[PDB]
Design a protein around this ligand. Sequence first.
Ligand SMILES: Nc1ncnc2c1ncn2[C@@H]1O[C@H](COP(=O)(O)OP(=O)(O)O)[C@@H](O)[C@H]1O
Ligand SMILES: Nc1ncnc2c1ncn2[C@@H]1O[C@H](COP(=O)(O)OP(=O)(O)O)[C@@H](O)[C@H]1O
Ligand SMILES: Nc1ncnc2c1ncn2[C@@H]1O[C@H](COP(=O)(O)OP(=O)(O)O)[C@@H](O)[C@H]1O
Lengths: 228, 238, 239, 144, 73, 248, 73
Amino acid sequence: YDRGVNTFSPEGRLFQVEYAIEAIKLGSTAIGIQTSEGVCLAVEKRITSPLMEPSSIEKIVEIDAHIGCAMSGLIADAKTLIDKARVETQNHWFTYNETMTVESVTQAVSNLALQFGEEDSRPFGVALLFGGVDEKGPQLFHMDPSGTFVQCDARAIGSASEGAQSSLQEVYHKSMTLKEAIKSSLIILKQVMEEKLNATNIELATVQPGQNFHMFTKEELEEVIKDI
Amino acid sequence: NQYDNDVTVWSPQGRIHQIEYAMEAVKQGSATVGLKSKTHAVLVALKRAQSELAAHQKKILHVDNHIGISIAGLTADARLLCNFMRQECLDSRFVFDRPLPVSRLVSLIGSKTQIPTQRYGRRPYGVGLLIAGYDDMGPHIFQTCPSANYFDCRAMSIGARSQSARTYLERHMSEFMECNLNELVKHGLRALRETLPAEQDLTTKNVSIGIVGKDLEFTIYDDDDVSPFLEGLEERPQ
Amino acid sequence: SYDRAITVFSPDGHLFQVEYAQEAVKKGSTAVGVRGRDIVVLGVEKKSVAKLQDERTVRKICALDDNVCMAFAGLTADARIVINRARVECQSHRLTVEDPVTVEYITRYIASLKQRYTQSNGRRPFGISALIVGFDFDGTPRLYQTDPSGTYHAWKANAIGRGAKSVREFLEKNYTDEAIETDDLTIKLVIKALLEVVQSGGKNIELAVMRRDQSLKILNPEEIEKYVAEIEKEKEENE
Amino acid sequence: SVLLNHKVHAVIGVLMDDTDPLVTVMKVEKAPQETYADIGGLDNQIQEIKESVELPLTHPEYYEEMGIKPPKGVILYGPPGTGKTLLAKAVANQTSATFLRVVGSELIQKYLGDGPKLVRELFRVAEEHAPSIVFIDEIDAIGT
Amino acid sequence: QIHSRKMNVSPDVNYEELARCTDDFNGAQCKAVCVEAGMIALRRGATELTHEDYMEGILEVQAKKKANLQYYA
Amino acid sequence: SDVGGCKEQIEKLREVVETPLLHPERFVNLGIEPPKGVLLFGPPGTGKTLCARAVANRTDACFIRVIGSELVQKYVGEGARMVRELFEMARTKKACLIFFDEIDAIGGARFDDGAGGDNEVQRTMLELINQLDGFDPRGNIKVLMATNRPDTLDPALMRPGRLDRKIEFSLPDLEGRTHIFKIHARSMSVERDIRFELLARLCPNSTGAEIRSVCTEAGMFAIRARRKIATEKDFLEAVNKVIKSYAK
Amino acid sequence: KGVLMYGPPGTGKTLLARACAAQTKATFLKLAGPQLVQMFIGDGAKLVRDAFALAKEKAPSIIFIDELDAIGT
Ligand SMILES: Nc1ncnc2c1ncn2[C@@H]1O[C@H](COP(=O)(O)OP(=O)(O)O)[C@@H](O)[C@H]1O
Ligand SMILES: Nc1ncnc2c1ncn2[C@@H]1O[C@H](COP(=O)(O)OP(=O)(O)O)[C@@H](O)[C@H]1O
Ligand SMILES: Nc1ncnc2c1ncn2[C@@H]1O[C@H](COP(=O)(O)OP(=O)(O)O)[C@@H](O)[C@H]1O
């Protein structure tokens, strides 16, 4: 049935891609939200042992000053795609002498993911969310391991993805301020990650057209952590 | 059953059923349409939603200023083939500065679709392609399938819920040929309206069209560009 | 799908064949590592030299560069191959490239190497986990865990091998907010963590220290009895 | 056994039972021999297994009457020869109930559901004579 | 025709257009379609099923509705 | 009301078994003889069978429930004859209601390419599927089917003469999960000031059998504390027993 | 002497056989091929022989072998 991706199901489905779809769930909860004010991302930081370096779980990361990433799945295969997203901006710097849009970074990472079925390596068990404030404004995009990509006004991946998504559909619209989007995301996060929120099990970042700078909104976001 | 493997293996019947599995993979839902006229060719692909906070996915691509395509699935092989068509058109302009005719381009795409089907180490294509174009010979609608065949058609439709669309197209092939651009796109959208689910009427948020003709490049139209084409649509009688 | 191959997901997203790396590591030797106030300190046990045998060739800890080394829990052949990769890699990179080498860089390289060997068929990913400690990362020492899966992380104090089971709780049982002061409490806490080893008396419990500026220093048998006695006296007075 | 007239076969007595098929041999009807005093020092497990499964079979009210409904099953783990079967026989000794040990891979019956039958019969004949303490040796086989 | 006459029906039925809508069926499936259309007519509150009932039946009996196209792998 | 939120599904069930025995005034006059049998499929082994029990309660019907194991013995051939015996002995009752579980293992079609193995299924299963009767050919008997896996079932079971309706279930929704705890508030003695509304939300996508297990687990919380009554904290951490440890 | 109804399922083979059993007033001997996949080494042969003997004893009788493929492999 499912020894390799060289053949499909007798239904025509691959017995591999949906496996990546549930493998999305092996990681912690993760959220991304686009507003006219920018894009924000969040991931549960739930530690294995708190005496591990607490920032070493780099599931909320900056790609560049105007672009950030969040992941769901294993950190190992996520590292390759995140590094691709980061290095393409410097490639744009050294070739076109200007900045790169998040759409084309998305396209390049998609083509890198889309290699395991048309080479001549292996599927990546990670779902990625990018948020940019790029040359086309605020722009949140989502890739599943399948190598396709879609624009999203908001999105949820990782554990408890679909419940968070369905509950967020009640409290979202395309163009609010990113701050109240953060608040509405957090009031759902508080119940999605484990039971209670702190740096050991929560993490979030954001970027705005008024801030092409310091996506790492951590430990200064503390007030809205205690706003909820 | 052992004979459900690499396209290198024939079943005892003399068939490669994995190609049929790719073909059935193509048939998995909402409708797409393609049809041409004396003046123009048109393709339509509805942008399927995901949620109230996620965007509809575009399913139409531009290849050259006389040719474009439409795509069904998760675009694993479809978009790559579209890019190869774009590079081939660029090579045609590099060699003779001409947008090469539709059929002779699609023949090479058919050959490329056949190439994996003989050898190991490469899965068959999981998408079906629709093509609308015009050239120095005329306007054409083409379509290609995982079985590596290519078809010049007056009308075509891939997916599910589209047999009603296919029957409407089979009925009004008598009109599709002589229509103008607007009449042709009206016919295509009527075929699509034949695909309406029980609880729905066509919305701008999903309908997306690509159009080409004898005096128009291949271009893409959305929402309020589709609406000037949605007018003249079939009504809802009983 | 099943655990018969690495390169395919389980029907629930699992990678059982890859996840066997935990017990692959667990059946090796036992080691512990910390970063002290400035000096990192590591220790190893489970030598059990069979009379004519020696631990000299066993080499549980090898110093790659004057500011980076690791601990090698797992199969010894793969450990030696990792020696020959990482040591030569850092040496050549520092000797030729415009930038120096850091423990973070070597951890990144090893993680990428293991992930890449996971990225193909017919290539067995290295079945060893390791504590990689470095003296220089913008001048600051630090510690990293690395796993056959290609995942890597930073730690304040960790244990690998058969000691990786208990110490995870043990450290959380007694790790003070104070990073273990100077080399006294650093080595004392190393000995406390290695007390989970067979006898904790220093008969086959060894250690080494790197002072964040100078190379790996060995707690050689002519002196390790002093640290063993320190640990024993500390455990006796607090009884 | 039933005592019958030799000529007219009329039931004219009843008598001691000394028979029944080999399932009785599979069952350990007698309360086991080892006690809590034989498990040296492994005393926290005494508390655990008392809280879990020892009390119900001589004090049902602690799991049926005290505003509550009874539990189902309790798992023990540790290296072979560390007290698993010994503690099971010790706790079953602490009551008069029958002990039913079965290893996970021994019940492989051929046709569909017959292994479920080989599990079902142990519960069926349970309250046919007094409740029981069931013990799967090496649960490993059944789920992973 | 056979099953409709057995069940009694509302006169406004296009059996020919039914057959056209029953593309690539086998007999047993349509045999089911008749009775389930009658059942939905029971749900419609009608005294006897008509063409709308067969339509609303075949609309569901045809397939298991399958997966979602624009995202199939 | 014992059904955990899926009252919608049991009601659409009753339209095809309860209604066409207790309310026959609309079936045959409108054309078709009253139906008698339906299938169910939902979440993993959760609540499915119990629906049948509620129906057989209000139907005032004798109830039989069967699994594939009870159509199987080391002695072969007789496994098919057991279904024949079952229908006959049920019709010796004053009409009876019979239910089958894991019908996938029974109503699953022929597998020729197995070339042997535990092959008794192939001898017995059609004697259910082909000797089974539907709405038309059925005597004075009511029948109900269920299984968690419908994709493998024989279309012969799917088609009429075997089935008169099909019903789908899912993991209990938020209203369903609240109602399950409402039901189980009767099943113990507790400090009945519970915020079950929040307990059902602390449960993410989850079953209702686990809800019963969690209620008995709050009982466990009382027992380990030797407390004469259960409390809301017992319910909370009993829910977390699954939610945390079964999903950490 | 022998007639094979053939075709994909849902077409009417069993129904046609039963109708012929009905209209003839003859004796109908219906069986399914899977009913003769019995486990015991020779019991299937004994069953077939006894069934044909019964058919001979019932003289104007019609044997029906549904799903011959199950045993005609
Ligand atoms: N607490 C104990 N007291 C006495 N003997 C013990 C104890 N724990 C283990 N043993 C020894 O180990 C065996 C029982 O351990 P157990 O784990 O039940 O073995 P197994 O894994 O074979 O069931 C006995 O042979 C006994 O001699
Ligand atoms: N929400 C619920 N309400 C009532 N009973 C439930 C619920 N969830 C699970 N059950 C349990 O499910 C058991 C049988 O139903 P089930 O196992 O689902 O049948 P099937 O085997 O067809 O899946 C009953 O013992 C019942 O206690
Ligand atoms: N044309 C028809 N008219 C009436 N009933 C039909 C017709 N075709 C099929 N059926 C019904 O469908 C069934 C056809 O399948 P059958 O002949 O039993 O073979 P299989 O068991 O392989 O499906 C018949 O039993 C009959 O009841």
